[PDB]
Design an enzyme around this catalytic site. Structure first.
Site, PDB file in Angstrom:
ATOM      1  N   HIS A  47     -19.290 -24.039 -74.315  1.00 19.44           N
ATOM      2  CA  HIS A  47     -17.919 -23.606 -74.015  1.00 19.44           C
ATOM      3  C   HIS A  47     -17.846 -22.612 -72.863  1.00 19.44           C
ATOM      4  CE1 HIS A  47     -18.940 -20.263 -76.830  1.00 19.44           C
ATOM      5  NE2 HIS A  47     -18.152 -19.570 -76.029  1.00 19.44           N
ATOM      6  N   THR A  51     -12.665 -13.313 -79.048  1.00 18.84           N
ATOM      7  CA  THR A  51     -11.759 -14.345 -78.615  1.00 18.84           C
ATOM      8  C   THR A  51     -12.300 -15.765 -78.715  1.00 18.84           C
ATOM      9  OG1 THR A  51     -12.337 -14.307 -76.294  1.00 18.84           O
ATOM     10  CG2 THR A  51     -10.773 -12.650 -77.104  1.00 18.84           C
TER      11      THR A  51
HETATM   12 ZN   LIG Z   1     -15.083 -13.497 -73.805  1.00 16.87          ZN
END
Ligand SMILES: [Zn+2]
Ligand SMILES: [Cl-]
Length: 257
Positions: free
Chosen positions: A61, A195
């Site tokens: 990612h 996050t």
């Molecule tokens: Zn980050």
């Protein structure tokens, strides 16, 4: 199973990670007029002279640069923090074009990318224990905007071709993360979260007011990375940012006016 696709992206994460809809989620939009200047907030202390980088990895990612976090002088402290936080890694978030990519926004403005230097509180012994506490981590966030090239970034961008696909890793020693910091350490701070999943609410966020400038070519090398493993069908790695989350009942403070 989570990712940044239409069917597994940030809008879906709450199904496997219910904390996604919690009270202290990140990132957030920083409203510069409502951020309260606290004149008592101290200067950040960023000591990276001894920071010992190890390897850079495509994790499917983003890409991440890992550090030897046994180096006890490689430290973030000061500012809003109690005690000492050790640097463990840094990574970025970026967009499919220059006009988006950051996670934090400032007066709703999106930046081309956002750098996160992730540090854990030494009072918890190690990173895995730290993330289970509300003051476990301190993440220093730094916006990138397009302009002049950032010389300290170049070693990072040039190595990305050799880790284009998920799982690929490369030795990455002698990288000095001081070359990624802007002149000013003025910042905003608030309590928030990771996050990416598991989205744990364990982070004191320290987001610098001053963006670093990077070149168009520099950030475009980010977008030549791929989410996929080798062999699989090419899926360029772009738009790996989580959007602003509800501020709820928190106050963003500023170290400056
Ligand atoms: Zn980050
Ligand atoms: Cl370049």
């Amino acid at each position: 199973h989570w990712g940044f696709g239409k069917h597994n992206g940030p809008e879906h994460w709450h199904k496997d990670f219910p904390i996604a809809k919690g009270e202290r989620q990140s990132p957030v939009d920083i409203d510069t007029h409502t951020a309260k200047y606290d004149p008592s907030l101290k200067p950040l202390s960023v000591s990276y002279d001894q920071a010992t980088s190890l390897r850079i990895l495509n994790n499917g990612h983003a890409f991440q640069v890992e550090f030897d976090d046994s180096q006890d002088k490689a430290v973030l402290k000061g500012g809003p923090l109690d005690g000492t936080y050790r640097l463990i890694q840094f990574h970025f978030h970026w967009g499919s074009h220059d006009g988006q990519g950051s996670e934090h926004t400032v007066d709703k403005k999106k930046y081309a990318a956002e750098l996160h230097l992730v540090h854990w509180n030494t009072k918890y012994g190690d990173f895995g224990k730290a993330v289970q506490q509300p003051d476990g981590l301190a993440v220093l966030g730094i916006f990138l905007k397009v302009g002049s090239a950032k010389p300290g970034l170049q070693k990072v961008v040039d190595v990305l071709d050799s880790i284009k696909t998920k799982g690929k890793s490369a030795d990455f020693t002698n990288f000095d993360p001081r070359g990624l910091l802007p002149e000013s350490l003025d910042y905003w701070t608030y309590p928030g979260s990771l996050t990416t999943p598991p989205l744990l609410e364990c982070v004191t966020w320290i987001v610098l007011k001053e963006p670093i400038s990077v070149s168009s070519e520099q950030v475009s090398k980010f977008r030549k990375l791929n989410f996929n493993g080798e062999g699989e069908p090419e899926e360029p790695m772009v738009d790996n940012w989580r959007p602003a989350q509800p501020l709820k009942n928190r106050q963003i403070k500023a170290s400056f006016k």
